[PDB]
């Protein structure tokens, strides 16, 4: 459960948040495969409640109605097609598994679902699965309201409702089986792993019981004995009775301290500075690298919906975001996930964005098609961070330097640092308020390299900055603090 199951040489996955199955199928063939991406996180593929007030928010997808592969992203046939095509070009699919609960208890009964399924929250009836009152933790939860009231109580966090979401009785073999039924259907379809949503609200042991019921990956695309990749969403920052280390036995975990700390260091908040990143990783009190799934932002905190707070960097802070993603992709710690979002009308009031609920680009509820512009960018309000030269190229950089050790670190005691990955790559950052001009030991073989942030190495030439490495591996770097992208990166494959 610790291996991503990506084919040899691909080191990252991208979250194509809210994308339609058909657009992802195309993306695998026309971009992801060619550009070297390892896989994709898809939004929950199972049927959810259709919420019209507000109008189809993104979070209505974390409010399950059944396990039918039928959502605004597409039906089951489109889903299978997508998984097939993507696998056929070596790009894996990872399903966002929402198994801790069903919908909110206050939701009106009826057939307001993405697939017409009938559900009745008030009476605990989800006939499409089916589930009834006996399958929820109502009698087990001890809070007066029935919802989680105190996170300092590990029991309560697991047995009570997360903001009213009907909590499933995961200790029951029946419920465990209905969930494994769902997951094995996906596995046999060809998916390579799962993101276990809200794993903090499930007992480590109940999760393990469910994983024991799972098949090995589809033998038509994966070698015999392959177990699905499992990453647990567990938000573990400061003091709480629950620790992310309690889930190491089921798979990897989301290391949220990563994006929070990186955000403040790069924002230079409260005395933080890049020079402190020398011992980035476990040295900062993070989980072990082989159990970590890292990222700069995720669908929740990029809109202030989770831990990380104000320090989190997102596409809205483009300049510093590229720098953070750059550092992440260059550094060896953990397994990296790149975010790919859509624009929404941020409307800040008293410091809070009242439009954080807005769902994906759409026409009367119908999600918009991802259109590709002549410059490879996207239209219809899809941000497509994964298509940004600086990010796309750093995804490739990670692939090239994969396995190479961290070395040749340099820092001016402030905000301009540099380090390399063995003799396969080197990167330099200037985050100070003054220019950076200096000759640094790079550890790369002599030659002329194309900087992959400012340009590309296209047919014998660089479209951007060029770096010259001498015989002793030295090379000169000059980065004005006024550069659009205050950092340079070169690797074995960008050498002319
Ligand atoms: C959001 C976050 O809260 C905790 O995170 C805690 C953290 O553990 C704690 O330590 C401290 O930091 O506070 C955090 C915030 O509560 C969990 O530990 C963590 O697992 C969870 N994140 C995952 C799971 C859910 C829930 O199904 C998703 O939520 C998403 O779906 C929910 C269900 O539709 C949404 O609620 C929505 O529906 C409810 C229905 O009753 C409403 O009452 C609620 O007002 C409305 O916003 C929520 O806004 C959205 O973010 C989310 O996309 C996904 O990433
Ligand atoms: C690089 O570009 C120049 C023109 O700017 C051209 O003279 C040169 O031949 C090109 N090199 C290759 C290898 O195509
Ligand atoms: Ca629970």
Coordinates of C-alpha atoms in Angstrom, one line a residue, residues 174-374:
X174 CA -21.8 -5.8 6.6
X175 CA -20.7 -2.2 6.1
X176 CA -17.1 -3.2 5.6
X177 CA -18.3 -5.5 2.8
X178 CA -20.5 -2.9 1.1
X179 CA -17.4 -0.7 1.0
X180 CA -15.0 -3.4 -0.2
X181 CA -17.6 -4.3 -2.9
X182 CA -17.3 -0.7 -4.1
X183 CA -13.5 -0.6 -3.9
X184 CA -13.0 -4.0 -5.6
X185 CA -15.3 -3.0 -8.4
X186 CA -13.0 0.0 -9.0
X187 CA -9.8 -2.1 -8.6
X188 CA -11.0 -4.6 -11.1
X189 CA -11.8 -1.7 -13.5
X190 CA -8.2 -0.8 -13.3
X191 CA -7.7 1.9 -10.7
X192 CA -4.3 1.8 -8.9
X193 CA -5.1 3.2 -5.5
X194 CA -7.2 5.3 -3.3
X195 CA -7.2 8.5 -1.3
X196 CA -9.0 7.6 1.9
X197 CA -11.0 10.7 2.7
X198 CA -11.3 11.8 6.3
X199 CA -9.2 8.9 7.6
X200 CA -8.9 10.7 10.9
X201 CA -12.5 10.0 11.6
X202 CA -12.1 6.2 11.1
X203 CA -10.4 3.8 13.5
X204 CA -7.0 2.6 12.2
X205 CA -8.3 -0.9 12.8
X206 CA -11.5 -0.5 10.9
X207 CA -9.6 0.8 7.9
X208 CA -7.3 -2.2 8.0
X209 CA -10.3 -4.6 8.1
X210 CA -11.5 -3.1 4.9
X211 CA -8.2 -3.1 3.1
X212 CA -8.0 -6.8 3.9
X213 CA -11.0 -7.4 1.7
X214 CA -9.4 -5.8 -1.3
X215 CA -8.2 -7.5 -4.5
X216 CA -4.7 -7.1 -5.9
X217 CA -4.5 -4.7 -8.9
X218 CA -5.9 -5.7 -12.3
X219 CA -3.5 -8.4 -13.7
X220 CA -4.0 -7.0 -17.2
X221 CA -2.0 -3.9 -16.4
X222 CA -0.1 -4.7 -13.3
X223 CA 2.3 -7.4 -12.2
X224 CA 0.9 -10.2 -10.0
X225 CA 0.9 -9.4 -6.3
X226 CA 0.3 -5.6 -6.7
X227 CA -1.5 -4.0 -3.8
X228 CA -3.4 -0.8 -4.3
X229 CA -1.7 2.5 -3.3
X230 CA -3.2 3.8 -0.2
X231 CA -2.9 7.3 1.2
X232 CA -4.8 8.4 4.3
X233 CA -6.1 11.9 4.7
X234 CA -5.1 12.6 8.3
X235 CA -4.7 16.3 9.3
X236 CA -2.0 16.2 12.0
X237 CA -0.5 19.4 13.0
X238 CA 0.0 20.5 16.7
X239 CA -1.4 18.6 19.7
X240 CA -4.3 16.3 19.3
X241 CA -4.8 12.8 20.8
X242 CA -4.7 11.4 17.3
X243 CA -1.4 11.1 15.4
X244 CA -0.8 10.3 11.8
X245 CA 1.7 7.7 12.8
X246 CA -1.3 5.6 14.0
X247 CA -2.1 5.0 10.4
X248 CA 1.3 3.9 9.1
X249 CA 0.2 0.3 9.0
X250 CA -2.5 0.9 6.4
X251 CA -0.5 3.0 4.0
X252 CA 0.8 6.5 3.4
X253 CA -0.5 9.6 5.0
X254 CA -1.0 13.2 4.0
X255 CA 1.7 15.3 5.6
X256 CA -0.1 18.6 6.1
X257 CA 2.8 20.2 8.0
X258 CA 4.6 20.3 4.7
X259 CA 2.5 22.9 2.9
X260 CA 1.9 25.0 6.0
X261 CA 5.6 25.3 6.9
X262 CA 6.6 25.9 3.3
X263 CA 4.0 28.6 3.0
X264 CA 5.3 30.6 5.9
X265 CA 8.9 30.1 5.0
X266 CA 8.4 31.3 1.5
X267 CA 6.1 34.2 2.7
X268 CA 8.9 35.0 5.1
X269 CA 6.3 35.1 7.9
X270 CA 7.5 35.5 11.5
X271 CA 11.3 35.2 11.0
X272 CA 11.2 32.2 8.7
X273 CA 13.8 32.2 5.9
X274 CA 14.8 29.8 3.1
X275 CA 18.1 29.1 4.7
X276 CA 16.3 27.1 7.4
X277 CA 15.2 24.6 4.7
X278 CA 18.6 22.9 4.9
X279 CA 17.3 20.1 7.0
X280 CA 13.8 20.0 5.4
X281 CA 11.9 16.8 5.9
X282 CA 12.0 14.6 9.0
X283 CA 14.3 17.2 10.5
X284 CA 11.2 19.5 10.7
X285 CA 9.2 16.9 12.6
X286 CA 7.4 15.5 9.6
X287 CA 6.5 11.9 9.1
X288 CA 9.0 9.4 7.6
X289 CA 9.5 10.1 3.9
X290 CA 8.3 6.6 2.9
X291 CA 5.0 7.2 4.6
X292 CA 4.4 10.7 3.2
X293 CA 2.2 12.1 0.5
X294 CA 3.2 15.8 0.1
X295 CA 1.7 18.9 -1.6
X296 CA 1.7 22.7 -1.4
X297 CA -2.1 23.0 -1.4
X298 CA -5.1 20.7 -1.7
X299 CA -8.8 21.2 -2.7
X300 CA -9.7 22.2 0.8
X301 CA -7.1 24.5 2.0
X302 CA -6.7 26.3 -1.3
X303 CA -10.0 27.9 -0.4
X304 CA -9.5 28.1 3.4
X305 CA -11.5 24.9 4.1
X306 CA -8.8 23.1 6.2
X307 CA -5.7 23.2 8.2
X308 CA -2.9 25.4 6.9
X309 CA -4.7 28.6 7.2
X310 CA -3.4 31.8 5.7
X311 CA 0.1 30.6 5.0
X312 CA -1.0 28.2 2.3
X313 CA 0.1 29.2 -1.2
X314 CA -2.1 28.6 -4.3
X315 CA -2.3 29.6 -7.9
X316 CA -3.7 33.0 -6.7
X317 CA -0.2 33.7 -5.4
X318 CA 1.4 32.6 -8.7
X319 CA 4.9 33.9 -8.3
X320 CA 5.5 32.3 -4.9
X321 CA 3.5 29.3 -5.7
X322 CA 5.7 28.3 -8.6
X323 CA 8.7 28.7 -6.3
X324 CA 7.1 26.5 -3.6
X325 CA 6.1 23.8 -6.1
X326 CA 9.6 24.1 -7.5
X327 CA 11.2 23.4 -4.1
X328 CA 8.8 20.6 -3.5
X329 CA 9.5 18.8 -6.8
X330 CA 13.2 19.3 -6.5
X331 CA 13.5 18.1 -2.9
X332 CA 13.6 14.3 -2.3
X333 CA 11.2 14.1 0.7
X334 CA 7.9 12.2 0.2
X335 CA 5.8 11.4 -2.9
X336 CA 4.5 14.5 -4.6
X337 CA 1.0 15.5 -5.8
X338 CA 0.5 18.6 -8.0
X339 CA -2.7 20.6 -7.8
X340 CA -4.8 21.5 -10.8
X341 CA -7.6 23.9 -10.1
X342 CA -10.3 26.2 -11.5
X343 CA -11.0 29.9 -10.9
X344 CA -13.8 31.1 -8.8
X345 CA -14.9 34.6 -7.9
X346 CA -13.1 35.0 -4.5
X347 CA -15.2 37.6 -2.6
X348 CA -13.4 38.4 0.7
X349 CA -15.4 39.9 3.5
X350 CA -13.9 40.5 6.9
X351 CA -11.0 38.3 5.7
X352 CA -13.2 35.4 4.7
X353 CA -14.1 34.4 1.2
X354 CA -17.9 34.1 1.0
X355 CA -17.6 32.3 -2.3
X356 CA -15.4 29.4 -1.2
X357 CA -18.4 27.1 -1.9
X358 CA -18.5 27.8 -5.7
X359 CA -18.3 24.6 -7.7
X360 CA -16.5 24.0 -11.0
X361 CA -17.0 26.0 -14.3
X362 CA -20.5 25.1 -15.6
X363 CA -23.5 26.0 -17.7
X364 CA -26.6 25.4 -15.6
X365 CA -24.9 22.8 -13.5
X366 CA -23.3 21.0 -16.4
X367 CA -19.5 21.2 -15.8
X368 CA -17.6 23.0 -18.6
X369 CA -15.3 21.2 -21.0
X370 CA -11.6 21.7 -20.5
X371 CA -10.4 23.6 -23.5
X372 CA -6.8 23.9 -24.6
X373 CA -5.6 27.3 -25.9
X374 CA -3.0 27.7 -28.7

